[PDB]
Design a protein around this ligand. Structure first.
Ligand SMILES: [Ca+2]
Ligand SMILES: [Ca+2]
Ligand SMILES: [Ca+2]
Length: 121
């Protein structure tokens, strides 16, 4: 027949590589594109990749997750460790929460960070 890849413009959309065949042609699409002529912008959010109630952004050849507060990572799969800096004073036990921490203060200590000494009273 004809070499559709040699007529002038690339018959493959979105800079796909045109490969000639006898009787037709084929397109080798760049990441994020699909269809016989790469016409379609793939929806990278279609498989629900964003975890923990994150918002998914469908972009060119990728998705981006917008995490709920307290979450991080590409899929918002990481619950940020708020206990990392050891915030509890006087032997308080740190419990990691969502965008927060809890200190389990020993007897005689109170306050968010176990700051208040009550032993003298
Ligand atoms: Ca052809
Ligand atoms: Ca896309
Ligand atoms: Ca946390």
């Amino acid at each position: 027949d004809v070499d559709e890849c040699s007529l002038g413009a690339n018959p493959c959309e979105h800079a796909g590589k045109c490969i000639n065949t006898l009787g037709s042609f084929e397109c080798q699409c760049l990441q994020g594109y699909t269809g016989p002529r790469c016409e379609i912008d793939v929806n990278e959010c279609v498989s629900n990749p964003c975890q923990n109630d994150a918002s998914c952004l469908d972009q060119i050849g990728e998705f981006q997750c917008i995490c709920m507060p307290g979450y991080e990572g590409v899929h918002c799969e990481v619950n940020t460790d708020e206990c990392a800096s050891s915030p509890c004073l006087h032997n308080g036990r740190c419990l990691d929460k969502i965008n927060e921490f809890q200190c389990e203060c020993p007897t005689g200590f109170t306050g968010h960070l176990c700051q208040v000494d009550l032993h003298h009273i």
